[PDB]
Design a protein around this ligand. Structure first.
Ligand SMILES: C[S@@+](CC[C@H](N)C(=O)[O-])C[C@H]1O[C@@H](n2cnc3c(N)ncnc32)[C@H](O)[C@@H]1O
Ligand SMILES: Cc1cccc2cc(C(=O)N[C@H]3CC[C@H](NC(=O)CCN)CC3)[nH]c12
Ligand SMILES: [Zn+2]
Ligand SMILES: [Zn+2]
Ligand SMILES: [Zn+2]
Length: 235
């Protein structure tokens, strides 16, 4: 099918044009941070020498205490500019494209090879309390929407990327996936991002195991094509 790049989403009227020809997904409002309907210490890594920075060595890598608790550092981190643990904030996203699938709608694929436990994208959207969430479920059912964009963030917080979000919203489900969600604390506030669970060759679709609690017996069928396909979306 047709494909497109994350920069294509920055030109609104051209996008809408590409959408008229079916060369891009339908329009949504692009945002770079979660938006709320309901109004809401440093680590101990030793500073790296300028020599160690030049050698290729990692600042706040795997032993960093902020990182081990999936907390990103701030500006006041000991390693300052060198800190590798500010990925959400610096928007250090993987190189991925938005493509048209056979039966799932649009999707995400890797433009380059991507290592294991590599950051893909933040799942951004409108954060909802339980009440707003239920309002929208019903509103969406009554508009006969086909695609749904809900992601559980925490107790009484669900991200809805139906109207406002970013390209994370195109990652499809798979019963045998190559990414997972991770919840990270940034400035005392929780966020969700997608991360590879294995190596993902260039061209391959990126998928995760969506486990949002299924309500009815009734569900969306799964066209993931795996050997182990559970048949439907949801947990
Ligand atoms: C967040 S969206 C993913 C983006 C969607 N493909 C689009 O075109 O906007 C989730 C929706 O994609 C579709 N979807 C995702 N994974 C799927 C799968 N494995 N089989 C069938 N539909 C899928 C479902 O309609 C679901 O409600
Ligand atoms: C981010 C992402 C990636 C891949 C798949 C999904 C599905 C969703 C999603 O929001 N699914 C919803 C469906 C409609 C349900 N409706 C009821 O349970 C009540 C009446 N059937 C709620 C869950 N989000 C996704
Ligand atoms: Zn650190
Ligand atoms: Zn740091
Ligand atoms: Zn499946």
């Amino acid at each position: 099918g047709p494909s497109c790049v994350m920069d294509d989403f920055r030109d609104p009227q051209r996008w809408k044009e590409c959408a008229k020809q079916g060369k891009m997904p339908c329009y949504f409002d692009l945002i770079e941070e979660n938006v709320y309907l309901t109004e809401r210490m440093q680590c101990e890594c030793t500073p790296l020498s300028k020599d160690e920075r030049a050698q290729g060595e990692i600042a706040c890598g795997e032993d960093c205490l902020n990182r081990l608790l999936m907390i990103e550092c701030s500006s006041r981190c000991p390693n300052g500019d060198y800190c590798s643990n500010r990925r959400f904030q610096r928007k250090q996203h993987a190189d991925v494209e938005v493509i048209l699938t056979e039966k799932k709608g649009w999707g995400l694929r890797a433009a380059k090879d991507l290592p294991s436990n590599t950051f893909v994208l933040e799942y951004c959207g409108e954060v909802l309390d339980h009440k707003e969430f239920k309002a929208r479920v019903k509103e969406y059912a009554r508009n006969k929407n086909i695609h749904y964009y809900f992601m559980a963030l925490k107790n009484d917080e669900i991200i809805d990327a139906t109207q406002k979000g970013n390209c994370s919203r195109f990652m499809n489900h798979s019963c045998e996936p190559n990414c997972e969600t991770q919840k990270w604390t940034v400035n005392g506030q929780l966020r969700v991002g997608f991360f590879t669970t294995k190596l993902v060759p260039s061209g391959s679709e990126l998928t995760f195991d969506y486990q949002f609690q299924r309500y009815g017996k009734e569900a969306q069928k799964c066209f993931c094509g795996s050997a182990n396909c559970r048949g439907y979306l949801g947990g």
